[PDB]
Amino acid sequence: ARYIGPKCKLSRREGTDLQLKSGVKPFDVKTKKANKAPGQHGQARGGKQSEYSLQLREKQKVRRIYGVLERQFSNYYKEAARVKGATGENLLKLLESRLDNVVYRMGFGSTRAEARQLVSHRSITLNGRRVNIASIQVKAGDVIAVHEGAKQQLRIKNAIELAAQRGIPAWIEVDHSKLEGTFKAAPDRSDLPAEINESLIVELYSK
Amino acid sequence: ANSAQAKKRARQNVKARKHNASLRSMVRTYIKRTLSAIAGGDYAVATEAYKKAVPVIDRMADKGIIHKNKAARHKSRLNAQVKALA
Amino acid sequence: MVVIRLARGGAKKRPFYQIVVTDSRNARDGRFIERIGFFNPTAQGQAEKLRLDADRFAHWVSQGAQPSERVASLAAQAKK
Amino acid sequence: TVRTLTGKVVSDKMDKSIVVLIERRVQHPLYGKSIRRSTKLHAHDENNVAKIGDVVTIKESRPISKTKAWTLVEVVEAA
Amino acid sequence: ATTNQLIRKGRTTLVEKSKVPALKACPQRRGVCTRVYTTTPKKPNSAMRKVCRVRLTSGFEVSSYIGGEGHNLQEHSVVLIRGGRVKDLPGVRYHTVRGSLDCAGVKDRNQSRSKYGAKRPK
RNA sequence: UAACUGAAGAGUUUGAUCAUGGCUCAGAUUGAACGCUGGCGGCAGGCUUAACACAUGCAAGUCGAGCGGGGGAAGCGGACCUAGCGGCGGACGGGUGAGUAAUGCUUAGGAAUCUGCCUAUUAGUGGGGGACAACAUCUCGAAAGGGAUGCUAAUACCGCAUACGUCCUACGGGAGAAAGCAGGGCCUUGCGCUAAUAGAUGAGCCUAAGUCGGAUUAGCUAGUUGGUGGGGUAAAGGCCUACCAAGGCGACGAUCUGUAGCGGGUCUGAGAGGAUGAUCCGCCACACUGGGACUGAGACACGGCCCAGACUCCUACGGGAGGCAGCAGUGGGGAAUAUUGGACAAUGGGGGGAACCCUGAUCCAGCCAUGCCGCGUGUGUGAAGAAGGCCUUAUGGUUGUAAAGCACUUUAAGCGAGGAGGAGGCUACUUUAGUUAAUACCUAGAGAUAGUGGACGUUACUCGCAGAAUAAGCACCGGCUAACUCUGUGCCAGCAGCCGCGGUAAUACAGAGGGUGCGAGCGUUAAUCGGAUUUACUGGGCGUAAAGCGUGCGUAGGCGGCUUAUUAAGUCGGAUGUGAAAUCCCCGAGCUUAACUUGGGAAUUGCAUUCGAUACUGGUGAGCUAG
RNA sequence: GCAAGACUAAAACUCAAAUGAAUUGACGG
Ligand SMILES: [Mg+2]
Ligand SMILES: [Mg+2]
Ligand SMILES: [Mg+2]
Ligand SMILES: [Mg+2]
Ligand SMILES: [Mg+2]
Ligand SMILES: [Mg+2]
Ligand SMILES: [Mg+2]
Ligand SMILES: [Mg+2]
Ligand SMILES: [Mg+2]
Ligand SMILES: [Mg+2]
Ligand SMILES: [Mg+2]
Ligand SMILES: [Mg+2]
Ligand SMILES: [Mg+2]
Ligand SMILES: [Mg+2]
Ligand SMILES: [Mg+2]
Ligand SMILES: [Mg+2]
Ligand SMILES: [Mg+2]
Ligand SMILES: [Mg+2]
Ligand SMILES: [Mg+2]
Ligand SMILES: [Mg+2]
Ligand SMILES: [Mg+2]
Ligand SMILES: [Mg+2]
Ligand SMILES: [Mg+2]
Ligand SMILES: [Mg+2]
Ligand SMILES: [Mg+2]
Ligand SMILES: [Mg+2]
Ligand SMILES: [Mg+2]
Ligand SMILES: [Mg+2]
Ligand SMILES: [Mg+2]
Ligand SMILES: [Mg+2]
Ligand SMILES: [Mg+2]
Ligand SMILES: [Mg+2]
Ligand SMILES: [Mg+2]
Ligand SMILES: [Mg+2]
Ligand SMILES: [Mg+2]
Ligand SMILES: [Mg+2]
């Protein structure tokens, strides 16, 4: 399953933008109910803490800006705890090497959900195959192209506009003419937004 | 027995059992003649009974009615028991 | 009788055989004397199709083991 | 090439057979202290040599009797 | 205490006891109810608690509790019972499963409908 | 180059406090069950209870190239088929966990042993005889099953002959086998048969050490413990026996007694531990209950026999038959667990020279959210912040970019086309090498030319068509613990893991709105470990919280001053065997990914053997004087 | 054990406390 519902709700609860609604003039001032958690009495609530609410809301934040559910997320964690480095950055690199996220980052698909219907509908090519699993771990060097019968639809070319002035990071060398990939090695805990405090997630999964 | 081969095996078991019983009884009878002669005490009678009993024991051990080690044991013990007679 | 045969353990519809030297009365996937190689009939990509320890094979065909038909033709594929 | 044990003769009243006590120091698995355990072996001396109190040496043989598969090699300390 | 004391006499475990002896390590149990009646709670509580007196296929005969508002049990009803004791009723250590063999689901329920055997209303 | 990385606390005794101490809670797990809900796929798993009773079908046959008879299609016959007898198989594979606390199992070692088929190696396969089935004739019986009279062949049986080696010898000697069949030109090949050896396999035997409780079970044993003669085994042995001697086992737990298949492993845990022994592998035991043996290389034989028993069934009353803990299936019991499916295509197994036949093993398919893993149920924009619901101070707030609206997309499901791989081979066609009168025949080896050969199977997979179209629920919201308001109710109805809520503004009951958490699932019950340092080895205590015996003396035991020599038992180090595979872990390899499958390592911390080191502990000798 | 009894020594069931030391009050014939 995947979450199919109101999306600005998730940003209003998580406080931050969350990067959903990849919009022309969203600017997180498209809902105008921002700075106000959802619901009948989410208004008079700025929030203090619980130290379990803190860990939980950190985890839900990281989970909702990648579209992962809780079973897959806990599997990511159990794998990242196994790799030799630190657990939190291992986890962030696992979430970074997913195919739908790499598609979002290279520029095709405006959101991570549009980049997920792109992948699920086989409009993507990974080293030649027409994959349709959004959770495939792209490895260093893999080539990510658009499919031939799906590179003239305006949805991707007009998302390539939002791809600039926004992104195409260091660890991804993408040309917007051939519509191609070559994702190079994974990022580190210096290339990703630093407000994500993944130590909260590591301490949540040790409760 | 349920299948036809199981009852054929039962038939053949009956026939083999009769045959083997005759041969095994024969071996025991010759050993008993040797032992009765030994208890008699005479050395000539004992040695002739032993000379008659050895080929029957060897014959029935060749056919698998008794094992060859059984045959060797009888041939060894009866011999040691007739050599002590004289 | 000692035989050299295939023991089928893989996945459903994707067999993977261990070439084993065993006593022929044992179950196909049960007790064996010695594993000497393997056979992967599908073996896509970079995977090995057939590995067959030749000196152990020769040692056992010397002690009187009898290969199967399949293991005979496979031992023909090797050393060649 | 053989397996030898050493002990003390605790009985000799049986016809040409001794009872020997082998002492062993087995370490406790959980509490890690070597505790003394003992085992009585019915061994075979055909000459009726060893007397109760001797220190002797035995070696495992084929069975000589029901519960007697050890045979004496010599007396170390004729006490 | 001392090492020698531990090697001589070890450390003894006190095995626990089941709080649901009449279930016989089964998750639930079928019973036939011989008495449907009401009890009053303990010291600080006040109610008319609906209780069932079942004979179980495991040979026991125990009192279980009927949860929810409104039931249809009588004598000779075949019910499924499970663990879980009611705090203020001393000695009731079982619950009747609503929506089971003879115990129907609670009526007019719309929240926590799984726990009362109520089907989704349409 | 990795094979490792690891440990959280809360509530509750009081007016409050600190402590002690129980109880309870948050995690992981499951062959689960139950409630509500339910789209798909891939992998697994699926009577845990009555080792309760079983309808019906199937689960062990095969060989005519061992042998007589027969029977008949096509042409007096040749091909073919097979009831008998005789080979081999039926001791495997499959099921179960009742019994079993040690004749089991695990680890490490041993002798005194056998071992069909297979591999090498030797020496042979000479010549006779008497039968018995089938068959024919009659007969008993309801049947099952039998009887009688003749006739028969054989690789069935038994003599005789001859033994490289084999066996017994008192060392001189003595003793002991076999069987032919087939293909080609009496000769050769094979396939058999005999006698041995040693290799494999497989099994039997022995030793030591471990393997749940219970002392509110302390004595047990009289073939019992040992010896000798004899007998018996494939083999050591009180295994059996007669005699002799008296022993043997026990508080390091004998005997008795409750429980229990055991291991690799599994779950949990930071570990140390603790629970556990489904599925997979090994070992053992068992086959309706209790005995017994036969035949065989192997059985004291799951679908063999005999005898006893219960139970079921047929009967003409005389008699007969049967054994799902094989696969399906039924009744029953139960909270609860599936189809009376397909094929031998693959891997095996049995028979056969082969052709081939058999195979409920296996490979597949069905059913079940039972688990794990994967995917889907759309994606963008969209404010008049519509309507409606809910709250409201009646203005507004909230549901909410949510919806409409506009623009796209087509996974999976549906419908069409293609489409691997699982099949190595065999048959024909030519040759080479052999063996041998022989280029025959038979073995092996090549080469290309076509025939074949897939249960699954509409296979995976690929490519088109259509259309947002076919696809979201469950628990919770007082604290622990993430998430709150209204209305109804009024110590009632009810809720409840614990604390506790409810007596007229209930954030705790019921409904609604909103929200949180999970999601094709979500809750509840049950169970194990955890948190619990709450049995404390790692890692606790005992003045007053539970806890120092009333006090001594002493047995077993534990532990013991200082110096020195020696030993090398403990201890340490190395080497060498072993520690099955699977699993766990690490690298990496294939499935579109993941589950899953798989290569190699690491590990298996053990035990054994052997070599070394002697500080410490122990032994032994010698001293000393602080106890 | 003459007996009175002593010693060894449970379980079902039940409760969510029981307890120690100290503190602030109140009370004390
Ligand atoms: Mg036959
Ligand atoms: Mg014995
Ligand atoms: Mg026939
Ligand atoms: Mg059992
Ligand atoms: Mg013959
Ligand atoms: Mg002869
Ligand atoms: Mg002859
Ligand atoms: Mg003796
Ligand atoms: Mg004797
Ligand atoms: Mg003797
Ligand atoms: Mg005892
Ligand atoms: Mg049992
Ligand atoms: Mg712990
Ligand atoms: Mg045989
Ligand atoms: Mg026999
Ligand atoms: Mg059988
Ligand atoms: Mg049966
Ligand atoms: Mg069955
Ligand atoms: Mg029933
Ligand atoms: Mg087959
Ligand atoms: Mg499709
Ligand atoms: Mg094919
Ligand atoms: Mg809260
Ligand atoms: Mg409720
Ligand atoms: Mg109210
Ligand atoms: Mg409510
Ligand atoms: Mg899922
Ligand atoms: Mg503990
Ligand atoms: Mg304490
Ligand atoms: Mg006290
Ligand atoms: Mg005192
Ligand atoms: Mg002392
Ligand atoms: Mg001492
Ligand atoms: Mg040493
Ligand atoms: Mg292993
Ligand atoms: Mg001294």
Side-chain angles (χ1 to χ4, degrees), chain A residues 1-21 23 26 30-42 44 46-47 51-207, chain B, chain C, chain D, chain E:
Chain A
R2 50 181 212 96
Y3 174 72
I4 303 170
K7 290 162 270 292
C8 287
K9 224 149 140 157
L10 305 167
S11 313
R12 303 217 274 122
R13 173 65 53 174
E14 286 316 313
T16 329
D17 179 61
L18 292 211
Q19 269 278 267
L20 319 184
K21 286 261 143 54
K30 72 158 307 180
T31 164
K32 292 203 265 77
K33 289 189 174 168
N35 288 9
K36 185 163 152 187
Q40 140 165 341
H41 35 243
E51 179 272 3
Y52 164 77
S53 186
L54 288 192
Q55 293 160 8
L56 171 82
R57 296 256 61 91
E58 184 58 53
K59 199 258 301 182
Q60 306 296 83
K61 200 201 59 188
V62 177
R63 263 187 52 195
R64 283 155 183 184
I65 76 200
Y66 284 97
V68 200
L69 250 56
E70 178 53 35
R71 203 57 169 282
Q72 209 152 86
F73 196 79
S74 84
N75 285 335
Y76 281 134
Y77 175 84
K78 291 182 210 333
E79 144 78 5
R82 197 184 59 67
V83 205
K84 201 270 312 281
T87 307
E89 35 205 349
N90 275 316
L91 186 42
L92 278 178
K93 294 179 311 223
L94 278 165
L95 297 171
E96 278 312 309
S97 315
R98 283 164 57 87
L99 187 69
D100 47 350
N101 172 62
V102 168
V103 164
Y104 165 79
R105 286 226 171 270
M106 298 205 318
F108 336 128
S110 34
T111 60
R112 281 162 162 105
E114 194 196 290
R116 213 219 165 104
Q117 183 159 95
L118 268 198
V119 163
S120 148
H121 287 202
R122 281 154 63 69
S123 320
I124 303 292
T125 277
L126 167 84
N127 305 140
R129 315 219 60 161
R130 290 185 69 184
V131 302
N132 64 338
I133 307 298
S135 32
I136 294 176
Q137 289 294 308
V138 184
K139 304 238 92 194
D142 280 326
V143 167
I144 300 133
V146 188
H147 182 62
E148 302 325 318
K151 37 162 45 179
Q152 291 132 231
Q153 45 212 41
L154 29 115
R155 146 174 83 168
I156 298 118
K157 84 172 176 270
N158 94 73
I160 296 306
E161 326 178 275
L162 315 143
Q165 90 258 336
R166 190 241 263 152
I168 41 175
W171 68 92
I172 283 192
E173 57 280 44
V174 42
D175 55 329
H176 300 289
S177 37
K178 306 212 318 312
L179 279 172
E180 256 165 80
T182 178
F183 163 97
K184 56 191 155 173
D188 46 320
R189 201 34 188 141
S190 85
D191 306 345
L192 325 157
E195 72 279 12
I196 278 70
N197 183 337
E198 69 279 6
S199 77
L200 285 187
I201 300 172
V202 188
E203 290 165 26
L204 181 64
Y205 275 100
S206 303
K207 271 214 67 30
Chain B
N2 288 106
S3 95
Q5 186 48 43
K7 36 197 64 151
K8 175 163 178 182
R9 274 292 190 186
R11 277 175 245 134
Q12 297 170 318
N13 199 310
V14 162
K15 284 182 37 185
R17 185 192 189 140
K18 283 165 177 157
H19 190 63
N20 291 2
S22 295
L23 294 192
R24 221 156 16 231
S25 160
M26 221 172 131
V27 158
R28 300 179 190 139
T29 278
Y30 279 77
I31 287 162
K32 273 160 194 143
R33 296 305 194 275
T34 303
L35 277 175
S36 75
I38 283 160
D42 194 296
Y43 176 81
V45 182
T47 190
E48 272 330 285
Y50 177 85
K51 290 326 227 90
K52 277 181 57 216
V54 158
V56 165
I57 295 171
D58 260 0
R59 224 149 71 227
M60 287 329 144
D62 213 321
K63 290 171 186 314
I65 306 296
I66 59 188
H67 201 279
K68 305 253 191 174
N69 292 352
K70 189 153 160 68
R73 191 206 323 145
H74 282 303
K75 273 147 63 180
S76 214
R77 288 182 182 182
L78 284 181
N79 179 74
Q81 288 183 14
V82 313
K83 180 182 152 157
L85 259 198
Chain C
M1 189 199 299
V2 191
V3 294
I4 305 155
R5 55 179 201 211
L6 296 184
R8 191 217 155 105
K12 175 159 85 161
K13 297 292 176 90
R14 316 210 83 202
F16 185 98
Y17 303 102
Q18 313 283 349
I19 304 171
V20 289
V21 182
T22 173
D23 161 44
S24 100
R25 265 158 323 164
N26 296 325
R28 176 192 76 196
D29 304 310
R31 147 188 176 163
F32 57 89
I33 296 140
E34 174 171 1
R35 178 195 162 228
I36 47 144
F38 64 84
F39 170 57
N40 194 354
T42 116
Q44 315 189 52
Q46 202 211 284
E48 200 143 315
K49 187 105 153 174
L50 163 72
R51 156 138 82 240
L52 185 26
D53 192 331
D55 54 44
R56 283 329 273 182
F57 190 81
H59 173 256
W60 282 108
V61 184
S62 179
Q63 317 288 83
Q66 311 272 320
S68 303
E69 307 111 273
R70 204 53 184 276
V71 177
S73 41
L74 284 175
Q77 311 268 91
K79 76 171 200 28
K80 171 171 150 181
Chain D
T1 327
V2 86
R3 295 220 166 169
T4 277
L5 295 167
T6 305
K8 294 182 338 288
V9 188
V10 320
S11 101
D12 54 299
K13 327 196 254 170
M14 303 194 289
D15 221 353
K16 49 167 110 169
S17 38
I18 45 173
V19 173
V20 182
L21 190 135
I22 324 288
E23 241 274 2
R24 178 179 29 116
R25 200 173 269 292
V26 60
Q27 166 121 343
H28 198 274
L30 192 64
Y31 300 125
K33 204 215 182 170
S34 52
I35 168 169
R36 278 170 170 267
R37 280 340 206 180
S38 53
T39 173
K40 298 168 77 169
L41 290 189
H42 294 198
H44 179 77
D45 62 315
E46 72 287 65
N47 306 316
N48 272 85
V49 172
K51 315 297 211 160
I52 184 185
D54 302 319
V55 154
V56 294
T57 274
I58 54 166
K59 149 190 45 58
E60 201 213 345
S61 62
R62 90 182 194 189
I64 316 286
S65 147
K66 163 188 202 172
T67 76
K68 184 210 283 192
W70 294 81
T71 181
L72 187 126
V73 190
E74 90 275 358
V75 192
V76 223
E77 285 297 308
Chain E
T2 79
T3 297
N4 229 47
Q5 276 172 338
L6 276 184
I7 284 148
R8 299 188 288 125
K9 314 133 296 190
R11 286 232 180 248
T12 93
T13 285
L14 330 158
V15 71
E16 261 298 299
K17 207 223 311 187
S18 158
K19 307 193 301 161
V20 274
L23 287 179
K24 294 261 219 67
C26 298
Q28 307 96 9
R29 223 93 180 74
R30 182 186 48 163
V32 62
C33 61
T34 70
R35 190 194 175 201
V36 174
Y37 60 111
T38 277
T39 331
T40 86
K42 271 189 82 162
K43 181 41 82 184
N45 267 355
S46 287
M48 293 275 98
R49 304 282 202 223
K50 320 297 182 290
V51 167
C52 205
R53 179 77 165 157
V54 274
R55 192 174 39 232
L56 296 179
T57 47
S58 51
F60 288 80
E61 179 155 279
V62 299
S63 45
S64 85
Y65 173 80
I66 321 176
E69 305 177 342
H71 70 82
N72 69 325
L73 303 183
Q74 294 121 9
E75 279 90 356
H76 311 100
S77 282
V78 188
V79 291
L80 213 71
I81 71 129
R82 65 172 219 254
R85 73 160 182 140
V86 246
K87 179 61 150 53
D88 54 10
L89 293 180
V92 188
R93 325 157 77 147
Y94 307 93
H95 274 67
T96 294
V97 179
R98 314 287 310 249
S100 59
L101 320 154
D102 274 351
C103 215
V106 178
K107 270 85 152 182
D108 208 8
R109 274 302 212 116
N110 223 282
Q111 304 169 33
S112 103
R113 262 197 296 102
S114 268
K115 319 206 171 170
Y116 293 100
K119 292 225 149 57
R120 198 161 150 250
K122 185 36 74 203

